[PDB]
Structure 1
Amino acid sequence: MIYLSRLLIDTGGNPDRPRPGRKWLDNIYNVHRRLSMAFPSGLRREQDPHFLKPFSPNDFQKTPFLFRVDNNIDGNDKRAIIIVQSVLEPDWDYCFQNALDFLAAPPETKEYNPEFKAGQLLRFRLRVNASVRRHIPEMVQQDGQTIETGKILHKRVSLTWDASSTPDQALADWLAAKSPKLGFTLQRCELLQLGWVYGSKPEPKNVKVKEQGQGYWREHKYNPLRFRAALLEGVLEVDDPKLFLKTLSSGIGKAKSFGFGLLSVLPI
């Protein structure tokens, strides 16, 4: 019981007119917020029928979901798609009823109920996060001297593959290291895109307190976010089919709310 939805984002076509779709896709945090906005529980749907209200994050269901933004070529054109997998029914009607300029085509919701056993060859294509935690973290490197401010800063930083090692093989063995826990096997994994994605979160702070109440003289700070990204496809061999359903319903990665994690599997 997995809803495999699909979006057809309306990008630009003239870099002299406003193109809100590309600007929206430029920031991953706004993409995540807009995708999460499609889940009104019982209050935002019935009280306001036109989404003309101030935004309240507590008014939306905290339903876990995965999404990957990518591109495809069907028969005569190139389309930017956002494949979204979720366990609750997505309310795309409530999401773009005011911002229909964002979307080029009406969305789709097709049920995905796979009954997959082991030992059958299947093909896949997923985008994954490529961060590791260094048990020996390098110091702060204060740029005036580039030695140290503190000593230890345990940080998710980057997956580094030696000096002359190939990146695709390194990513393949890194995935195959955790593959027995998940329950598949790789033979011809390949790397297509390897880069970074960027975002910015508000994360409000406080500066001054009111003359008669709480610290409502507060303003908005801004915390940037960076993510190392890999996109990889190939074929996987199914083992222990109980676990593969959990991996399909959960996703492989550490940034499942920022694109990485969704795995799309097709039969041979």
Structure 2
Amino acid sequence: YFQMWLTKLVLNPASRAARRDLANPYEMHRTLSKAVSRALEEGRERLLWRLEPARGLEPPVVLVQTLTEPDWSVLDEGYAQVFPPKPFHPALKPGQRLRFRLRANPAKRLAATGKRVALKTPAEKVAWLERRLEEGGFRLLEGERGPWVQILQDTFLEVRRKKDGEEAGKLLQVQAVLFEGRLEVVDPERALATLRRGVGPGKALGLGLLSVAP
């Protein structure tokens, strides 16, 4: 009995709370977790989101995926224009090809030190995507000149948490890479699990939401 609910939110830069969440991924996460907070307590929810930041005429847009039905009545308005939540039941088939979008943290844990660190080059960011995808029931489409993936954005998130009331807390340091391309469904059952579970670290930071479409 699987659906994923998708909610689009168009945030309002006039709002101090919006502006806070748009500057800090961890604040953003707190706000979105309220829509599904009883379900978060119940252990079988996986809140995923992706922010498309404001550019030009385009306001800031967040795509939010939850496995249970969200209640956005918790948000104040002024905060965002909330599009009606909708459930999706993707019907995935072997050999079916799809566009995808994914902001993710392509990373490795170093043998020598045990630190999780960012993969340095585009080629290794793609190799990482390739592997997580394949283990997740997908396969990058291979074009004439290489794979059907583009790195649109590659940024180093450095997000301060607060602590003990209003003290400086941990600095969350995570490399964020926006991928867009085409893929093939290899194993439908696995692919649906990947869509529901997400790809890679920083899920509570707006990473790991794999979006596919015809």
Q: TM-score range by the shorter chain?
A: 0.7 to 0.9
8 A Cα contact 1:132 1:157, kept in partner: yes
Distance in 2 (CA, whole Å) between partners of 1:128 and 1:226 is 13
**3-state secondary structure, aligned to 1:197:** strand
Give structure 2 stretches of 5+ with no counterpart: 143-147
1:184 corresponds, among 125, 128, 138, to 138
Distance in 1 (CA, whole Å) between partners of 2:167 and 2:18 is 25
1:136 corresponds, among 101, 105, 112, to 112
String of CA shifts for 1:92-115, please: whole Å, max 9, x gaps. 01222xxx2221x23320111111
Using structure 1 for the length normalisation, give the TM-score. 0.69
Q: Which amino acid aligns with 1:5?
A: T
Percent identity over the alignment?
34
Give structure 1 stretches of 5+ with no counterpart: 13-17, 43-57, 138-153, 162-166, 205-217
The residue number in structure 1 matching 2:212 is 265
Q: Structure 1 residues 245 and 95, CA, compared in 2 at 3 Å: closer, same or farther?
A: same
1:66 corresponds, among 48, 54, 67, to 48
String of CA shifts for 1:123-170, please: whole Å, max 9, x gaps. 101111122111012xxxxxxxxxxxxxxxx21122123xxxxx2x33
Between structures 1 and 2, the one with greater strand share: 2
Give the greater-gyration-radius structure (CA).
1
**3-state secondary structure, aligned to 1:79:** coil
User: How many residue pairs get matched?
Assistant: 205
Counterparts in 2 of 1:72-151, with a 5 A limit?
77-96=57-76, 100-103=77-80, 105-137=81-113
Counterparts in 2 of 1:216-227, with a 5 A limit?
220=167, 222-227=169-174
**3-state secondary structure, aligned to 2:211:** strand
State the superposition RMSD in angstroms: 2.5
- Higher relative contact order (Cα pairs below 8 Å, separated by 6+ residues): 2
| Runs of 4+ residues over 6 Å off in structure 1 | none
8 A Cα contact 2:160 2:168, kept in partner: no
Between structures 1 and 2, the one with greater helix share: 2
Q: Which amino acid aligns with 1:123?
A: R
